[PDB]
Design a protein around this ligand. Structure first.
Ligand SMILES: N=C1N=NC(N)=C1/N=N/c1ccc(F)cc1
Ligand SMILES: [Co+2]
Ligand SMILES: [Co+2]
Ligand code: NA
Length: 263
């Protein structure tokens, strides 16, 4: 039950994906020691609504109270922007943006290293991004999603890191989360052969320590059980006749938007 997007639908997803990437490009100069995550979220929401003329997909979703998710250090995902939570030197911070424009969603996230980097935070982020890139290079018609999950997990584990099991990438379109599930690890339950026109995300969450996670009493914030650092990067893509096209590419990405496997 995976929708195949029309050329028209794909163009709408290009528009929405560009907007989502542009929020991440816009916010970058504000991501500095001393800024609050609450302030970052307000800046993002104002940009999305007032400049992009779009809406945040997260706001109100299952009751989520903010417009973006901002996850620092051992927070794995779903970190809630807060006026009292200040960024500081050495922090690694995920900002995850999902916008709806003209009925279609764009979904992307990246890590920011705040101020003076720690070497371990830098390495975790780099390996996490590399694991996303490796997976993007695999996407083409006929490949199984299982092969991609397996490859992400092998790469990450060889570095002494772990992949979070509880969360996955997803189909995306008129809905935020559509079929298929995109596991970032090997499972016998995964059997999805890719076809041109499918649109989905890849979004591995990678912990420096052990894979186990925990939800806080606020009902939202997820942390590593061992309090190790965690990192995530996310792109939305469309499968093409010969590979894929990344819909949420930024200028700071170092992988081509259009990946072709033809001669
Ligand atoms: N699956 C996701 N990809 N990017 C995001 N921001 C995602 N999910 N966010 C949420 C997931 C569950 C929820 F209740 C509220 C938000
Ligand atoms: Co996202
Ligand atoms: Co997503
Ligand atoms: Na994190």
């Amino acid at each position: 039950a995976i929708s195949i997007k029309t050329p028209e639908d794909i163009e709408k997803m290009r528009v929405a994906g560009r907007l989502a990437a542009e929020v991440l490009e816009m916010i970058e100069p504000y991501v500095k020691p001393g800024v609050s995550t609450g302030e970052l979220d307000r800046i993002c929401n104002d940009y999305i609504v007032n400049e992009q003329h779009a809406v945040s997909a997260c706001l109100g979703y299952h009751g989520y109270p903010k417009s973006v998710c901002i996850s620092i250090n051992e927070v794995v995902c779903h970190g809630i922007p807060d006026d009292a939570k200040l960024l500081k030197d050495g922090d690694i911070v995920n900002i995850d943006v999902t916008v709806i424009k003209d009925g279609f969603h764009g979904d992307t996230s990246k890590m920011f290293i705040v101020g003076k980097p720690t070497i371990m935070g830098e390495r975790l982020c780099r390996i996490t991004q590399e694991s996303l890139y490796l997976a993007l290079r695999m996407v083409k018609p006929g490949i199984n999603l299982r092969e991609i999950g397996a490859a992400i997990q092998k790469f990450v584990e060889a570095e002494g890191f772990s992949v979070v099991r509880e969360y996955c990438g997803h189909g995306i379109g008129r809905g935020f989360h559509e079929e298929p599930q995109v596991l970032h690890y090997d499972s016998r339950e995964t059997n999805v052969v890719l076809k041109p026109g499918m649109t989905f995300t890849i979004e591995p969450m990678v912990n420096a320590g052990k894979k186990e996670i925990r939800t806080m009493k606020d009902g939202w914030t997820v942390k590593t059980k061992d309090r190790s650092l965690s990192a995530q990067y996310e792109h939305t893509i469309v499968v093409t006749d010969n590979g894929c096209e990344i819909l949420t590419l930024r200028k700071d990405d170092t992988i081509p938007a259009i990946i072709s496997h033809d001669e």
